[PDB]
Structure formats: structure tokens, C-alpha cells
Amino acid sequence: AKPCTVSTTNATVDLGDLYSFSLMSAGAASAWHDVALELTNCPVGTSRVTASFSGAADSTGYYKNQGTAQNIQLELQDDSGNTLNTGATKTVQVDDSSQSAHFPLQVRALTVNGGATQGTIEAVIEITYTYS
């Protein structure tokens, strides 16, 4: 189908300041933080948008931190309990009343192996859309 206009070409989510002591134990994590993607001006006949996710993963399968903090990975989910690790897809319906589509998502940091170290958190997840 014909494509929509990507409204949110870049989106940021700031996990803020996390604390090494709170991320010392294996399995520790931050709270979930929202982020969303939006498409607009969806042509008549286009009723579904599929987002395909990609980004650098580490040995836990989650997204790798590219910042200086060690032993931190990043988890992306949708709003329904599905993890969207690299290669995942998510499909949503176009809202005909507004000719728009949106993807409500959430991100957290977690330390699978424990012992997160001080430094920055930086990661980028890329999304390509297909239309049907």
C-alpha cells in the first residue's frame, strides 16, 4: 500500500539518573519510560502499518549500551507485554478518522548479570515501516 508520512522521525526517551547501588544485583532494572512513534496523512487504502526494529544487541539479546556505563542493557516493549528486540516487528491499524497510526512503546534499563558501572547510557533503535 501507499506509505504514510512519518511524523516522529526521531524520538528520545530519557531514563534519567540511575544509581549503581540500585543496579548492583543481577536482575535489577529501572522503571519503564514511555516513548511513541506516529505516522500521519495515511492514504486511503492503507489500513496497517508494520514497524520493524533493529539495533545493536549484546549477548543477553537486549539492546547494547553504547555509552560508557558497563553491564547495562536496554529493553524495548510495546504496550502489551511484547519485547521488541532486534528484528522484531509490531503492526497497528490505521485510524481512518484521523488518517494516522501510532506505536506506544516503553523502555527500561536492566542489568542481566549485575554490577552496572558509572557512566552514560546511549542506544539507538532504528525503525523501518511497511504498509499494507
Binding site: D17, S20, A116, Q118
Partner: peptide, 15 residues
């Protein structure tokens, strides 16, 4: 990429 999500934050040292 059509969109990019940038994740930011900082791990502070409190032991």
C-alpha cells in the same frame, strides 16, 4: 531508517 529511538540516561556512582 524511517524513525530512530534514542535512549539516554546516566548511571551515577553511589556504591
Amino acid at each position: 531508517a524511517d524513525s530512530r529511538i534514542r535512549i539516554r540516561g546516566y548511571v551515577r556512582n553511589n556504591g
